[PDB]
Symmetry: C2
Subunit: 97 residues, 2 copies
């Protein structure tokens, strides 16, 4: 987990390496991002393992909830992001190298 | 997880370091050991995290189900064990050093 928020955007990075994309759900409700995962795996000798989590995050009030995106990388990182809407009211300048 | 089984006993070791003793349940049913854990934690900014698992293990038919024990170590290791009942039918000899 890393949650980053700047003037331009809000981003959640969440390591979910033990989960398949179909195991995950992401919902936004009442100004919270709600992320759930559940993965079940058969073991040797008729055992099984279930891994499960929930993560609730507060969503800043200026994130555009009509422009949210979420993706899962091949290496198991979930990225959830949204741009911030300008309200009309120091500014970092990128240094290229 | 490590599951060990010798002529004397059956032992499950399971790392549950993110769980409190009150978060865990252990049940034996239909020749399976069923271990569950769920731990919820409040975060900063009104977030929360839930961690949850299930682990089902087959219990050997010769384990004495009247003499099962389970404990959680300070460092978060769960040990579940039972002795085997002698049936009446090579044998390792310990080497002390």
């Amino acid at each position: 987990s890393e949650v980053r928020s700047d003037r331009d955007k809000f981003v959640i990075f969440l390591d979910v390496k033990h989960f398949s994309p179909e195991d995950l759900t992401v919902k936004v409700q009442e100004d919270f991002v709600e992320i759930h995962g559940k993965h079940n795996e058969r073991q040797d000798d008729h055992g099984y393992i279930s891994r499960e989590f929930h993560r609730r995050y507060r969503l800043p009030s200026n994130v555009d909830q009509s422009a949210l995106s979420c993706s899962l990388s091949a290496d198991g990182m979930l990225t959830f992001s949204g741009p911030k809407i300008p309200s009309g009211v120091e500014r970092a300048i990128p240094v290229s190298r």
